[PDB]
Structures are given as structure tokens and as C-alpha cells.
C-alpha atoms as a printed R data frame, in Angstrom:
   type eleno elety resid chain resno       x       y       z
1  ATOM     1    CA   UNK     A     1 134.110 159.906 207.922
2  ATOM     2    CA   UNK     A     2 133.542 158.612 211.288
3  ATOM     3    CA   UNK     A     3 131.037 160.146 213.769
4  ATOM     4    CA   UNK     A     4 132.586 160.335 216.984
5  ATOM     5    CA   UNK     A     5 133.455 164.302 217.144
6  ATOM     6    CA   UNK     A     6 130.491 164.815 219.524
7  ATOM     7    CA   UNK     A     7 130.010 168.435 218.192
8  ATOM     8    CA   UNK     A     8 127.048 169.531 220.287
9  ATOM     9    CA   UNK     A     9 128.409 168.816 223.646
10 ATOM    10    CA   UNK     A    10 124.778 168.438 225.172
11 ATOM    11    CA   UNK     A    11 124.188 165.590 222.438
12 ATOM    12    CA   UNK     A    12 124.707 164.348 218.796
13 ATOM    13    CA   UNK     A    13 121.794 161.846 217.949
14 ATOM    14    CA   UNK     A    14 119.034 159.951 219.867
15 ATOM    15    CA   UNK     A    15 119.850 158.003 223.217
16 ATOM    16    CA   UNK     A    16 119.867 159.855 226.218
17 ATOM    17    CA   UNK     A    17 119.106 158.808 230.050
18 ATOM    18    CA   UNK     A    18 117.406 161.900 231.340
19 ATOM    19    CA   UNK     A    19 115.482 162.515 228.636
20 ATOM    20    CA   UNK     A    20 112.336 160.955 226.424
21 ATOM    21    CA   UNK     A    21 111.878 158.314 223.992
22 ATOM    22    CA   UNK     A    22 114.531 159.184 221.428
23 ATOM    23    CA   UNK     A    23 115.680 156.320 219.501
24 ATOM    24    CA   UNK     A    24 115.800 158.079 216.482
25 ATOM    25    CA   UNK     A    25 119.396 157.478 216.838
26 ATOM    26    CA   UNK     A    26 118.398 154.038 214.584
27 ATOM    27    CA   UNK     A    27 117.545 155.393 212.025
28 ATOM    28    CA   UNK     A    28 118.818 158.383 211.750
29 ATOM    29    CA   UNK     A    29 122.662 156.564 211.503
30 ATOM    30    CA   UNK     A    30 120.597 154.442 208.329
31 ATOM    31    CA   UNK     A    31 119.159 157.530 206.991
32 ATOM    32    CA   UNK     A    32 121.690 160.068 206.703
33 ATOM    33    CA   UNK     A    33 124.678 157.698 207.598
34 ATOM    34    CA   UNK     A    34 122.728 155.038 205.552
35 ATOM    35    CA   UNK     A    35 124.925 152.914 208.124
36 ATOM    36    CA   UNK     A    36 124.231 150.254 211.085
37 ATOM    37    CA   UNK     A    37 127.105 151.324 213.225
38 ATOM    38    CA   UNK     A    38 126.181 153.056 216.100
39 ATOM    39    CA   UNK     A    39 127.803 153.626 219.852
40 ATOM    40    CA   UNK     A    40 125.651 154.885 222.558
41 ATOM    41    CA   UNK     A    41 127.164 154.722 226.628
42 ATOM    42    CA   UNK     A    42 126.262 157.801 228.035
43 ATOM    43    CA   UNK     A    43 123.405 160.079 227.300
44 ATOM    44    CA   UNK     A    44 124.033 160.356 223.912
45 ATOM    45    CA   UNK     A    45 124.399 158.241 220.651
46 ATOM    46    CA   UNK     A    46 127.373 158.103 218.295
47 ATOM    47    CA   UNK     A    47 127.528 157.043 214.330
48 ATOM    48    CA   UNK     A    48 130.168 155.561 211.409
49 ATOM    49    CA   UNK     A    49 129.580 157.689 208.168
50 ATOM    50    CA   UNK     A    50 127.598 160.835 209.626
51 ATOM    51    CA   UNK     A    51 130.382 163.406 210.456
52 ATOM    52    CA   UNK     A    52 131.190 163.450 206.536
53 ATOM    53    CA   UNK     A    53 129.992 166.863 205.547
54 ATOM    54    CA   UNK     A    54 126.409 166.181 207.621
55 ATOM    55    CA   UNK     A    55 125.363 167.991 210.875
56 ATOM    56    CA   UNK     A    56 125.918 166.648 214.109
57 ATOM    57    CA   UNK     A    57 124.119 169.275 216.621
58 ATOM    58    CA   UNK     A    58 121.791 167.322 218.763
59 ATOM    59    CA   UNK     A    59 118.934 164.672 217.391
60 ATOM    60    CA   UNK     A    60 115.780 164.245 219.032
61 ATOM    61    CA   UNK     A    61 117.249 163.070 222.158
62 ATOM    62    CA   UNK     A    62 119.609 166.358 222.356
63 ATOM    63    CA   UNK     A    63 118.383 168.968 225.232
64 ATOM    64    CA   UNK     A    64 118.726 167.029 228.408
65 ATOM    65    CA   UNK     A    65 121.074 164.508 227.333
66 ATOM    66    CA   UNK     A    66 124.816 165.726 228.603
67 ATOM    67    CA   UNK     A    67 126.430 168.977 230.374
């Protein structure tokens, strides 16, 4: 299952430009997603293989990231 549903609306995984050093969103996609594909634009990060079943409610660099 693909992981573009952006759930939390402030911010799914790691990435964010107001906010702190959170590039968890590495491995967190090839940890839980166990998967290299990843999409970050905005203040946010996306994932392939994480919206099947998992949580998707903010990483580390959730909080600041989006309104």
C-alpha cells in the first residue's frame, strides 16, 4: 500500500523546512516500509509500502512541519 494519504495533516515522516534535523524520514521508509521510495517537496516526507496497516501520524519532523 502506498504512502501518500498524508494522515496527520501537520506531517507524516521526517523532512520538514521550519523545523529541526529530522531525516528520520530515511530510515524510517527502510524500517517500517523496509522500502527506498520516498517523496519529500514540502515540509513533510512521503513513503511506498508504509500506509499498509502502519501509522502515519507525524515522525520526528511532525510539529512544525505543515498547517
Amino acid at each position: 500500500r502506498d504512502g501518500y494519504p498524508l494522515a496527520s495533516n501537520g506531517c507524516k515522516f521526517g523532512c520538514s523546512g521550519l523545523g529541526e534535523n529530522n531525516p528520520t524520514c530515511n530510515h524510517v521508509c527502510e524500517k517500517k516500509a523496509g522500502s527506498d521510495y520516498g517523496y519529500c517537496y514540502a515540509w513533510t516526507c512521503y513513503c511506498e509500502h508504509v500506509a499498509e496497516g502502519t501509522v502515519l501520524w507525524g515522525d520526528s519532523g511532525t510539529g512544525p512541519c505543515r498547517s
